Every structure is written in structure tokens, then in C-alpha cells.
């Protein structure tokens, strides 16, 4: 039962990478909660990249909070490729002016055609569907995410929806959908020192370690040798 235990590590903040940006306000709510509790409840789930680097796949705000507090290291659970898959959050907002505003500002090749290829992006309004096909985009298809998301996101209150066929088909509502990125794509983004718009990607992860309640005082211990001691003992007291 110590599979989890074996994969809890104390990783330096400077060796962890983000593929999304963080919302500035979510950070201060998380950081305030952690300080009020004086412990970080959940460990930051990461996936191992090459050269001793790691990518956050859950706990962006936890990571950035501890980093802001000056924690040299953060508690992570290393996840394996077998344990998690990648998906996407569907965005539901009300249809509005931003659709035309987006159209003339960027003039993307929206089409009604239902091709043998899968849509890179989908726009649902009524019983109609408009798509982007990565071929029509060709190059500059890395950036279109930021352009499509930024249009409605800001003048609309976004509502995240999972692919469980849970939408209400309002006559007036629109539903944005994004093709999931492969792991290779996300890795490249991180390698280029780049990011993608937050609130789109969705990591479905199994075998998660929850409610570890790592005390802040431990993560604030400047002395390295002593920090490992209390940490290793902390993982001893709490079996996994």
C-alpha cells in the first residue's frame, strides 16, 4: 500500500514547470487559505520530465502559493503516464457581440463542413456547429487557443463543463470545445518557455494522494539536512 508513499518527494520549486498561467486572484485565495491553516492540504501532483524537471498537472495555485511564500521545496506526488489521461473543459457562455468581434479581429477559417478529420475547435450555437480544422490554420495554430478563448473570456462569465453530455441546449447559449492536446504537445510548450490559456486542459488522474496536510513550518525549514529528516519522518508517521 506504499505505492503512493514511494512517490512522495520534496522537489525544488525551480525545477517544476507550468504549462498554464495562474489566475491572479485564485492565487491569493489559495495562499490565504494555506496560511490560515498553516498547512498545505494536498500535495502538488506532477509528472516527471527529462533532466530532473517536473510539470504540474494539478495544484498550480498550490505551487505558486508556496513559491510566493519563499518555500525552496514543495511536496509533490510524482504521477506516472499510466495513471493519468488528458481531456478538455468545455466553455459555456451566452452568445453575444464577441463572436463578430472575434471574426473581424482575427478572421479565422470557421466552417460548417463536417470532415473526416476531427475539429481542433468547435463552436455550438443552436443546432449549428462551426469548426476550426488545424489544416486550415496550418502554422500559427499554437496561438489560436489564446485568441478564441480571450474573445468570450472577459466579456462573459465562463462556466466549465466536462464531456459528460451535461449541457443545457439553450436557444441563446454557445458551447466552446477544444481538441485535447497530446502529452507531446504540452511538453513542447513548456520546452519553449511558453504557456497555454488556463481553464482548457483537464488532467484525469488516478491513484491520487489527498489530504496529506503537510505543515507549512516544515516547508519553511531553511536547513536542508534537517528538512529531509522531518520530511522522511513525516512520511513515516503518515503511512503514504
TrEMBL record:
The keyword ATP-binding applies. GO terms for biological process: chromosome segregation; positive regulation of sporulation resulting in formation of a cellular spore. The keyword Zinc does not apply. GO terms for cellular component: chromosome. GO terms for molecular function: ATP binding; kinase activity. Signal peptide: none annotated. Keywords: ATP-binding, Kinase, Nucleotide-binding, Transferase. PANTHER family: CHROMOSOME-PARTITIONING PROTEIN PARB-RELATED (PTHR33375:SF1). This is SbnI protein. It comes from Staphylococcus aureus (strain Newman).
Amino acid at each position: 500500500m506504499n505505492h503512493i508513499h514511494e512517490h512522495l518527494k520534496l522537489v525544488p520549486v525551480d525545477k517544476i514547470d507550468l504549462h498554464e498561467t495562474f489566475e491572479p486572484l485564485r492565487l491569493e485565495k489559495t495562499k490565504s487559505s494555506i496560511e490560515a491553516d498553516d498547512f498545505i492540504r494536498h500535495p502538488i501532483l506532477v509528472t516527471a520530465m527529462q533532466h530532473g524537471r517536473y510539470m504540474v498537472i494539478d495544484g498550480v495555485h498550490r505551487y505558486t502559493s508556496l513559491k510566493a511564500l519563499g518555500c525552496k521545496k514543495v511536496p509533490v506526488q510524482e504521477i506516472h503516464e499510466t495513471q493519468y489521461s488528458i481531456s478538455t473543459w468545455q466553455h459555456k457562455v451566452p452568445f453575444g457581440v464577441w463572436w463578430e468581434t472575434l471574426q473581424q479581429e482575427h478572421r479565422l477559417p470557421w466552417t460548417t463542413e463536417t470532415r473526416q478529420e476531427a475539429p481542433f475547435i468547435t463552436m455550438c450555437h443552436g443546432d449549428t456547429e462551426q469548426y476550426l480544422y488545424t489544416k486550415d490554420l496550418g502554422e500559427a495554430h499554437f496561438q489560436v487557443w489564446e485568441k478564441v478563448v480571450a474573445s468570450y473570456s472577459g466579456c462573459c462569465s465562463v462556466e466549465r463543463i466536462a464531456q459528460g453530455t451535461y449541457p443545457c441546449l439553450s436557444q441563446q447559449d454557445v458551447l466552446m470545445k477544444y481538441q485535447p492536446l497530446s502529452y507531446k504537445e504540452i511538453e513542447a510548450v513548456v520546452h519553449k518557455g511558453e504557456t497555454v490559456p488556463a481553464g482548457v486542459t483537464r488532467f484525469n488522474i488516478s491513484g491520487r494522494c489527498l489530504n496529506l496536510q503537510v505543515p507549512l513550518a516544515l516547508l519553511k525549514q531553511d536547513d536542508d539536512v534537517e528538512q529531509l529528516r522531518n520530511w522522511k519522518q513525516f512520511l513515516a508517521d503518515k503511512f503514504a
